[PDB]
C-alpha cells in the first residue's frame, strides 16, 4: 500500500497521509468550486516544499490567465518557473476551432505529457477539466479511451496525478467514470447562503476519512475539522 503527502491546510489528515501514489486521482465538482485551484495549490505545495516538479495541463484556461489566476493569492510562478519549477502544458483550444476529416488518437497530447515529465523530472502532474475535452471534440467515444490510456500511462510511470471535472449531491459522476480514486468538491446552497465542502467517497485500497466536511479558501485552500 502506498501514500503521498500534500499539506493543503487541513486536507491531508482526512486522507491520513495524502493522495495515493502511482494511481489516478479524479476531482469533480460543480462549476465555481475551485477544482483548478485545488490542482494549482496541490502542485505548488509539491514543488515548493518537496521540490516535487510538476505539470499543469490546461484545456479550459489560457496560461497567462492561469498565472494571473494564481497570482491573486501571492504566488509568482513564471519567474520562479525559470528555475525549472512546474510546466504548464498548453491544451487551450485553437480559437479558430478545428475541422475533422476523420477520427483521432490523442497520442500527441499524452506523449507530449510524458516528454514534459521526463524532461522536468516531475513526479506530480495535475490536469484541468476533462469534460472540456469532451466538449472540445464532439466525439464522446474515443476521449474516454484515450483519457484511459493517459491515466493508465501515469499509473505505469508511478507519478501522482490529478484530474478535474464538472447538480452536486445528486447523480454526480459527471460523464467521465474511468478513474481510480475520487474526491468530490461540492458547494451547497441552503436558504440564501453557501457552504463549500469536500466529500471523499472513498480512496480505493487505502485509508480515507468518513464523510463530507465544509471548507473555505485563503492563500491556499483550508479546513481543519477533526480535533482530538
Amino acid at each position: 500500500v502506498k501514500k503521498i503527502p500534500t499539506m493543503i491546510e487541513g486536507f491531508d489528515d482526512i486522507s491520513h497521509g495524502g493522495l495515493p501514489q502511482g494511481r489516478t486521482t479524479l476531482v469533480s465538482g460543480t462549476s465555481g468550486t475551485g477544482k483548478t485551484l485545488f490542482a494549482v495549490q496541490f502542485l505548488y505545495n509539491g514543488i515548493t516544499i518537496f521540490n516535487e516538479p510538476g505539470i499543469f495541463v490546461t484545456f479550459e484556461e489560457s496560461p497567462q490567465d492561469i498565472i494571473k489566476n494564481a497570482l491573486s493569492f501571492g504566488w509568482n510562478l513564471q519567474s520562479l518557473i525559470d528555475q525549472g519549477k512546474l510546466f504548464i502544458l498548453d491544451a487551450s483550444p485553437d480559437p479558430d476551432g478545428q475541422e475533422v476529416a476523420g477520427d483521432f488518437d490523442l497520442s500527441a497530447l499524452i506523449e507530449r505529457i510524458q516528454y514534459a515529465i521526463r524532461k522536468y523530472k516531475a513526479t506530480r502532474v495535475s490536469i484541468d477539466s476533462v469534460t472540456a475535452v469532451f466538449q472540445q471534440y464532439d466525439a464522446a467515444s474515443v476521449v474516454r479511451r484515450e483519457i484511459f490510456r493517459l491515466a493508465f500511462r501515469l499509473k505505469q510511470l508511478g507519478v501522482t496525478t490529478i484530474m478535474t471535472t464538472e447538480g452536486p449531491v445528486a447523480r454526480f459522476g459527471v460523464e467521465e467514470f474511468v478513474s481510480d480514486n475520487v474526491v468530490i468538491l461540492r458547494n451547497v446552497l441552503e436558504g440564501e447562503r453557501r457552504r463549500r465542502t469536500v466529500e471523499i467517497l472513498k480512496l480505493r485500497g487505502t485509508t480515507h476519512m468518513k464523510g463530507e466536511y465544509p471548507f473555505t479558501i485563503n492563500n491556499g485552500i483550508n479546513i481543519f475539522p477533526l480535533g482530538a
Binding site: 502544458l89 498548453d90 491544451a91 485553437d94 479558430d96 478545428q98 475541422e99 475533422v100 476529416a101 476523420g102 477520427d103 483521432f104 488518437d105 490523442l106 497520442s107 500527441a108 497530447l109 506523449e111 507530449r112 516528454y115 514534459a116 471534440y137
Partner: protein, 88 residues
C-alpha cells in the same frame, strides 16, 4: 518556397490511412502543391509541442495563406479535398 507539414503517431492505423490517402491526394490531384514533413511524435515530440499539437494525425499548412491546421484520419475525402485550395 512551398511548404506543407504533417504529424503522425508512429504507425497507428488511423495515421497510415491518413498517410496513404494523403500521398494519393498528392499524386492524383496535384503532384507538387507543397513539400512535406512527417513526424513520429513518439521520439521527437518537442517538435509537436513547439507545434503545440494535442491530437494525431494532425495535418497543417502555413504559407501560402492562411495559417491552418486540420486533424484526423483524413478519411472524409470530401472536406479535406475541400480543405486544399489556394488561388491566392
Amino acid at each position: 518556397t512551398a511548404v506543407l507539414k504533417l504529424y503522425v503517431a508512429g504507425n497507428t492505423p488511423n495515421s497510415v490511412r491518413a498517410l496513404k490517402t494523403l500521398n494519393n491526394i498528392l499524386e492524383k490531384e496535384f503532384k507538387g502543391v507543397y513539400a512535406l514533413k512527417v513526424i513520429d511524435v513518439l521520439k521527437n515530440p518537442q517538435l509537436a509541442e513547439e507545434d503545440k499539437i494535442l491530437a494525431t494525425p494532425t495535418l497543417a499548412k502555413v504559407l501560402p495563406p492562411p495559417v491552418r491546421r486540420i486533424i484526423g484520419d483524413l478519411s472524409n475525402r470530401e472536406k479535406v479535398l475541400a480543405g486544399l485550395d489556394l488561388l491566392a
